[PDB]
């Protein structure tokens, strides 16, 4: 990808990230995307998803993901603003059951 294009997909993912209390950068067919995005719909939590695989700039959007955050699968979840990491990161917090405060904290849960 392009120095330009780079820059623009870091500046739509943050802006993203900072415009939505829940985001999950994923690809329609990964497991753990859909596993993560499957959790956040029983717990009510609303989420606004980027699947990579239907986007023409999904590339360039996962190298400014790995600029930003340091983390080079999906799905990369976002929680207030704030980088979690993917399934596993969201997954552990849900154990502790701190995941629940977190999502109603941010307004993604109701």
Not at 2 to 21: G, H, Y
Not at 23 to 34: E, Q
Not at 94 to 108: F, I, N, Q, S
Request: aromatic content about 6%; glycine content about 10%; hydrophobic content about 35%.
């Amino acid at each position: 990808p392009t120095e330009e294009q780079l820059k623009m997909a870091l500046q739509k993912a943050q802006q993203l990230v900072n415009s939505n209390p829940l985001v999950v950068f994923s690809k329609t067919y990964a497991g753990y995307c859909s596993r993560v995005k499957k959790l956040f719909d029983q717990l009510g939590a609303r989420y606004q998803t980027i699947e990579l695989d239907q986007e023409s700039d999904g590339d360039a959007i996962q190298a400014a993901l790995l600029q930003w955050t340091g983390q080079r699968t999906v799905p990369n979840v976002f929680i207030g603003g704030k980088h979690i990491g993917g399934c596993d990161s969201v997954m552990e917090k849900h154990r502790d059951g701190k995941l629940v405060p977190m999502l109603t904290e941010c307004g993604a849960i109701a």
